[PDB]
Design a protein around this nucleic acid. Structure first.
Ligand SMILES: [Mg+2]
Ligand SMILES: [Mg+2]
Ligand SMILES: [Mg+2]
Ligand SMILES: [Mg+2]
Ligand SMILES: [Mg+2]
Ligand SMILES: [Mg+2]
Ligand SMILES: [Mg+2]
Ligand SMILES: [Mg+2]
Ligand SMILES: [Mg+2]
Ligand SMILES: [Mg+2]
Ligand SMILES: [Mg+2]
Ligand SMILES: [Mg+2]
Ligand SMILES: [Mg+2]
Ligand SMILES: [Mg+2]
Ligand SMILES: [Mg+2]
Ligand SMILES: [Mg+2]
Ligand SMILES: [Mg+2]
Ligand SMILES: [Mg+2]
Ligand SMILES: [Mg+2]
Ligand SMILES: [Mg+2]
Ligand SMILES: [Mg+2]
Ligand SMILES: [Mg+2]
Ligand SMILES: [Mg+2]
Ligand SMILES: [Mg+2]
Lengths: 43, 120, 185, 144
RNA sequence: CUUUUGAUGUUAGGGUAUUGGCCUAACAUGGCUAUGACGGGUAACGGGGAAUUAGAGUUCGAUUCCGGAGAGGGAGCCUGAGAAAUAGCUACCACAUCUAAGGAAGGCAGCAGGCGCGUAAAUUACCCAAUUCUAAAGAAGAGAGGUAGUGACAAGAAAUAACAAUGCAAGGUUUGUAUUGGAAUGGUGGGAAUUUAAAACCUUCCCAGAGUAACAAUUGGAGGGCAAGUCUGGUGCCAGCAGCCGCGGUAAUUCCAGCUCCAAUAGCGUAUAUUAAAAUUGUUGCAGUUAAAACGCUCGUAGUUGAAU
């Protein structure tokens, strides 16, 4: 059959590049943020 | 200059000709003191006319500064030091130096001896 | 040969990794006591858990069995030292009743937060890492450090901190001072 | 009665029955028969290196409808021919018709996986570059 | 099964450092075995131990110590207190180096290093300073040993902010979160102090030294199992994913993307094996009318079990 179709869909899809984001928090800070989102003010 | 040396497990030893001790240098705030000053202090403490019967080693400065442990060795006279200190320590002190490049191509040379009536 | 310097795992993983309730609890703990991972929590659990196991074992033996009296007593003493029990609750049935909060309380960062020093838990942690804080003579820059009740009172800003009396001594404050001087001249 | 003997001096019977019966356990048999080393391409190993012999399609199990892209490869170790499914949206063409492929299991010991009929192997490196890396593409490009 | 070829024993010897079929001679006909002899297999060196277990257990143990064995393969010797030695020797076999072709030497399962094999593994480093050994025994040697180098095998600790103002938010005034802005600090760079056999690290101090603190966190997921989207486009039983069930036949919460979220996080995936999960090997602790499973039936040896006193 067809090995011609191998890599169809990916090729078809339009390359939208990532974009700038606010450099994420990491470790402790991130955890703190998560906590805040979940329990503290919303609770 | 604001640094006390407290001298711990001090041990006279007349089998050798030395006093051993552990040696803690309290120097709160102003961190690290060079060996020379310590030696001088030691000399002052123990009358000890000449500075270079003192051998210091193993000065670890401990986490946070402020304190600093070591090992003091103090010999009777320089002759004694010469006799039973290992050469490296002596060299470090500054009593001697042989900068002899024996190497371990010495070993190679040694094994290149097959039949000897050899200067060569 | 190999070295003989033997080493050991301080923390076991969960078992069931996406149980909701447990996860939530862990998160809460993290929030309260300013911890970096679930790993810290796990480590503390392990620490607690060993002790608990020991206690359980001791309880399986009867009183005035030598082992029970000696080892059990030792355990109790250790707990007391750690600041886990104190006066009222020193009977070996009580050392089972320890939970994670009891242990986390005695972390250095938590202690710092309690005893003024910093506005927050997070703040306290950063202070500890940034070479301030001392626990009786010795500086300490690990927030995990389980403070023993013998050395709880002897906690403050270290001798060599900017805010323990030893110059602004920073990249920041010093720089600012320099700038000011330049402006003046 | 229990079925088993529960005598104090019964141990011989108890051991012996267990020893014979263990072999009914499929998993145990798989572990402890010697045919493992004989009748297995990887010959008791995690991965294996095989040069490719044929880029080939394999039609899936009846309910699902796809032609899954496999690679019939020859193990250098063993001289064994095996089909290895290649992952990725378009990762058959990332390999050459003769490339030194490094192929792993599929996840189920020998047993075959998912839609595929009797392909027990997952190519996961070509010319020493990681298939996954190539798929991502931001990481790497196939050297040749 | 073992026994002409010592198998089992007795006698006498020979031999050994000594006991012994260890070997010889002579004489018995023994010895082992269903409590598995004798074979076969082991991807087997043994043990101390390792992993994993509530408790049992199951697997692993080439590998820090002890023991055994071997120095390409067998065999044979010399020396010596001790070797059937291998950086001793003799011989053959199998590899293989130099040679002026006559001969000659050679043995990394020492340390590095190289090729090969491979899924799969580091420097032709520095030193005897420590630990030890050997010696004509401080003073010499030691790839034994140690020190660095490579090292995401594992193991431990731990950054990637914090804080305060207003602005905005919600809650019964406080927490939370967008502007500003002074404090904190490692990292990184350079000096020292020390460290060390000499350096390098560690720690230590002094100069340098963050705001997009570009000093930029990843990995794998978001239908269920299972924490997290019926968010946006692309594809259209194709490509693909999917450990399993399943998703895809133009609304795909499953493909390909982007965004957002979730987990664990300087780690996180995949594979093969293994333990637990497995009371799915069941001694504890399974099941056998119908789910796999009571021998057609009885007798019966070993086996297991055996009234009370
Ligand atoms: Mg400082
Ligand atoms: Mg005879
Ligand atoms: Mg073997
Ligand atoms: Mg072993
Ligand atoms: Mg082997
Ligand atoms: Mg060899
Ligand atoms: Mg030999
Ligand atoms: Mg050799
Ligand atoms: Mg030979
Ligand atoms: Mg080698
Ligand atoms: Mg490796
Ligand atoms: Mg020595
Ligand atoms: Mg070595
Ligand atoms: Mg869910
Ligand atoms: Mg997968
Ligand atoms: Mg869509
Ligand atoms: Mg997606
Ligand atoms: Mg199991
Ligand atoms: Mg169980
Ligand atoms: Mg069953
Ligand atoms: Mg039936
Ligand atoms: Mg019947
Ligand atoms: Mg009977
Ligand atoms: Mg009875």
């Amino acid at each position: 059959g067809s090995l011609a179709r191998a890599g169809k869909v990916k090729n078809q899809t339009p390359k939208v590049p990532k974009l700038d984001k606010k450099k994420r928090l990491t470790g402790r800070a991130k955890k703190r943020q998560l906590y805040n989102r979940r329990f503290s003010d919303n609770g | 200059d604001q640094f006390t040396i407290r001298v711990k497990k001090y041990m006279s030893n007349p089998l050798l000709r030395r006093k051993q001790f552990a040696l803690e240098i309290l120097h709160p705030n102003k961190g690290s003191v060079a060996k020379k000053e310590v030696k001088e202090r030691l000399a002052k403490m123990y009358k000890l006319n000449n500075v270079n019967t003192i051998v210091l080693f193993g000065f670890k400065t401990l986490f946070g500064g402020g304190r600093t442990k070591g090992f003091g060795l103090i010999y009777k006279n320089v002759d004694a030091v010469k006799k039973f200190e290992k050469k490296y320590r002596l060299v470090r002190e500054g009593l001697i130096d042989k900068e002899t490049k024996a190497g371990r191509r010495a070993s190679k040379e040694l094994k290149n001896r097959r039949k000897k009536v050899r200067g060569t | 040969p190999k070295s003989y310097r033997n080493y050991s795992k301080t923390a076991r993983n969960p078992k069931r990794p996406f149980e909701k309730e447990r996860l939530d609890q862990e998160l809460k703990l993290i929030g309260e006591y300013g911890l970096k991972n679930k790993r810290e929590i796990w480590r503390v659990q392990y620490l607690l858990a060993k002790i608990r196991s020991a206690a359980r074992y001791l309880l399986t033996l009867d009183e005035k069995s030598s082992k029970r009296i000696f080892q059990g007593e030792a355990l109790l003493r250790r707990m007391v030292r750690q600041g886990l029990l104190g006066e009222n609750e020193e009977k070996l049935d009580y050392v089972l009743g320890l939970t994670l909060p009891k242990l986390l309380e005695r972390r250095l960062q938590t202690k710092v937060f309690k005893l003024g020093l910093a506005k927050s838990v997070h703040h306290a942690r950063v202070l500890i890492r940034q070479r301030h804080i001392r626990v009786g003579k010795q500086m300490v820059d690990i927030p995990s450090f389980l403070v023993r009740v013998d050395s709880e009172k002897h906690i403050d800003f270290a001798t060599t901190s900017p805010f323990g009396g030893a110059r602004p001594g920073r990249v920041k404050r010093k720089s600012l001072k320099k700038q000011k001087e330049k402006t003046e001249a | 009665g229990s079925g088993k003997p529960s005598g104090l001096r019964a141990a011989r019977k108890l051991r012996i029955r267990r020893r014979t019966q263990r072999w009914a356990d499929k998993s145990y048999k798989k572990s402890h028969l010697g045919t493992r080393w004989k009748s297995n391409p990887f010959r008791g190993s995690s991965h294996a290196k095989g040069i490719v012999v044929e880029k080939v399609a394999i039609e899936a199990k009846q309910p699902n409808s796809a032609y899954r892209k496999c690679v019939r490869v020859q193990l250098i170790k063993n001289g064994k021919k095996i089909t290895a499914f290649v992952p990725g949206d378009g990762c058959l063409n990332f390999i050459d018709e003769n490339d030194e492929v490094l192929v792993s299991g599929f996840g189920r010991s020998g047993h075959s996986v998912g839609d595929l009929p009797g392909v027990k192997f997952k190519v996961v490196k070509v010319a020493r570059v990681s298939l996954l890396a190539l798929f991502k593409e931001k990481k790497e490009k196939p050297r040749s």
